[PDB]
Amino acid sequence: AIRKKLVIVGDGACGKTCLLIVNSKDQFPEVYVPTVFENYVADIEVDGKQVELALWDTAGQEDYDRLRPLSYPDTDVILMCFSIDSPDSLENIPEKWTPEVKHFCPNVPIILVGNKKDLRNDEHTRRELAKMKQEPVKPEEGRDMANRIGAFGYMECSAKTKDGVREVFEMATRAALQA
Ligand SMILES: Nc1nc2c(ncn2[C@@H]2O[C@H](COP(=O)(O)OP(=O)(O)NP(=O)(O)O)[C@@H](O)[C@H]2O)c(=O)[nH]1
Ligand SMILES: [Mg+2]
Secondary structure, X not given: OEEEEEEEEEOOOOOHHHHHHHHHOOOOOOOXXXXXXXXXXXXXXXXXXXXXXXXEOOOOOHHXXXXXXXXXXXXXXXXXXXXXXXXXXXXXXXXXXXXXXXXXXXXXXXXXXXXXXXXXXXXXXXXXXXXXXXXXXOHHHHHHHHHHHOOOEXXXXXXXXXXXXXXXXXXXXXXXXXX
16 A cells, blocks of 8 residues: 555644544544544545555644644645634635745645635624624635645535545545655
8 A cells, every 4th residue: 555644734723633533533532632642544545546644633723833843754745724714714824834834844735625614604603703894714715825825726624514524635645646
């Protein structure tokens, strides 16, 4: 089998851990974990080839900035996430995540991922953003950002409903197999 390393980054609470858990496991017990601390491996088939994808979770909060790069050596693909319910998390894609990952992971493909897609039409989310004169991120804004930062692609998913989650990891595998 082909061995590749994936790292997931993005703003605190944008859904990174949930995304890794829902693709990897068949039962999600009630423990909250800031980062996956066991060795999660995605077994994915791409055009008749078996890829083993080691999934490396990272902490989004800034107090973890000094230790985060320990996760970066020898990465084959990056999942760079924001939350569709958070315009602020999208703004931090070009301002923080892109220069960090480009420094520590030169020439490594980035898949830009809009998480929490289920919240785009959620009434509570709409109201909480509306009170501050904001709204959920639109798909064209994700596309434009992926173009701006030089990402290999833009995808949307929901760890809650599972929509789009297989596709994210299958596309990450395809990107990782290019170099
Ligand atoms: N509605 C909805 N909520 C989600 C989704 N994914 C995660 N959440 C919720 O968002 C919160 C943050 O999730 P989590 O995976 O812990 O975020 P994180 O990006 O790993 N945070 P950190 O960077 O601090 O480790 C949790 O309450 C979780 O239930 C999703 O697709 N939809
Ligand atoms: Mg986490």
